[PDB]
Fold this protein.
Amino acid sequence: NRLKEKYNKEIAPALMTKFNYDSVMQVPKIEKIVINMGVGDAVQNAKAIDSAVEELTFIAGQKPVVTRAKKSIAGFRLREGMPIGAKVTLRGERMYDFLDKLISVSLPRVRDFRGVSKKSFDGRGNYTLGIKEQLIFPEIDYDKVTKVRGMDIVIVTTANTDEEARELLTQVGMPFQK
Amino acid sequence: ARIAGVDIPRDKRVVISLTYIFGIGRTTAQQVLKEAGVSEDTRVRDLTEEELGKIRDIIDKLKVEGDLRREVSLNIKRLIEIGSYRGIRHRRGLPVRGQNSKNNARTRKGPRRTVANKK
Amino acid sequence: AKKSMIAKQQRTPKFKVQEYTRCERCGRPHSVIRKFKLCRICFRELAYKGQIPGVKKASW
Amino acid sequence: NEFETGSVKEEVRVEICSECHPFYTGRQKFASADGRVDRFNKKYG
Amino acid sequence: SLKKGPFVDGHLMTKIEKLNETDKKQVVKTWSRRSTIFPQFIGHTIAVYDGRKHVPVFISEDMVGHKLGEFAPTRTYKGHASDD
RNA sequence: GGGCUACACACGUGCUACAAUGGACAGAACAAAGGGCAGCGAAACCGCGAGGUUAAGCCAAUCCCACAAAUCUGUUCUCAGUUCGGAUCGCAGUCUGCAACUCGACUGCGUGAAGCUGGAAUCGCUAGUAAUCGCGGAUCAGCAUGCCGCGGUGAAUACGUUCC
């Protein structure tokens, strides 16, 4: 909750002076994060896609749900049924308890990483990010999982423009390649 | 995982255990352990709660995994944009140091295959 | 071109490293022992001729 | 460094923190000293 | 090389020196490829005598310790029959 | 100045390994022969190393090249692409030479290919031979996995002329 108090006292007042706001009260707000698994099956016979689903319980406490395909693909499995990947939509106090782990711990842990996200902005608001290691998340043990599985994060901004959406992220302490 | 060089193994003595680090080799490990005074110690992984940290600092002075990969990468990229001839050998599949090509030198060339006959 | 070669050698080289060994009896370069400055074949024919002691041949 | 949060485990030791990581901690030299030396600085007399 | 030091034949030295002090003449042939590039030599473009034909060579700031003749390969590629 | 060193590949011939009869570390111990004055160059000192500084002695059964290596004795790793092997390459040095890019050798550091004994087929050798470990020389400014020698350790089998 320390991150949650942080924008209630530090970020917002500074954000208010950076440019004018209609009706004073208006301020961009984080909405939902969506973590993707993908897995890739390779090919369909994981055999246990659910074993990957258990792994995501560590990255976030919200229960993952498998994303069943709504369309068949000629190049890869499969027609509808036998779900591929998983999805999570953490909210509330969980939102900043998770984001606090992201800046302070997750991103710096990565080897080659120093900073990203420049062209990444939609020009509308939403942020996107890729995650390629479970070593990135401290709660996971090294002994578990063995083979690497992919991950994603998508922060949402209330702001109607990326110029406002970006400035909100900078005060959060989010890294940028610059 | 891990405290110094990332992903050092387990159930092995500390010297070979950090030779695996992309940076330190054998003799360099002999030097950092000479600074350590560990005496080997420990066959498995059990060093000491704080000594692991002070060794983590000395290893931190040495540099550095994937960035060291960036050193060689930026170096060869410096060796190709420069003209060149050395990076030219780097991408011909030609050995760079200078050791013919009429026989062997398959380290870059690969195995298969063959496309000639006479007569 | 052996006359041109011996003429090339008897003349002083621009650099001291240049002076390769060669026998006087024959103008052939290469495969000339430095210690005696003779041709292997030069020394062969002189060996059948016998120039130095001694025994000759294939002892020990 | 210590941090008070919440987890399944009562205690969580952590190898790396933002207060220790060189990037988050301003612009510490850490080990580089990037660009030393490039693209040229080679002279000896 | 070794120590004291890199060794130009020395005619290129006075040539690039006079070209640096004045005139700023560009493109000049040389047969002596053995000479190493120097900081005073920077920015010049030399036709390099591979043997068959001179190959002009610009000098970027990045190149110094590399031999001047190294940049131009005498070798002709490849040559091979059925590519792909 | 190049090229004789090409490079998609084939073949001939060597070298190094694919490892616990082993690897690595420490200690200890046994040679022969050959070369050396435009040379060998000790010892002392500097550098992790290569070598350098300086310099005694030796025209040599005197002195130098020069320390033999396998081995033995212990410590350690405990069966794996490994503390197996070293390839390839990067960086930083070093010897020789007017000069080491093409196209030299060596060292320090770093990188750690392939290969876990090899199809069809094929070679050598009857004892100090095969097996294997080091050393020297001719060559030679520098460059010897090649060649020529030196010694260490040191077997198995030979019923026989059916067959090649």
In short: Chain B is about 45% helix and 0% strand. The CA atoms of residues 93 and 108 of chain B lie 5 Å apart.
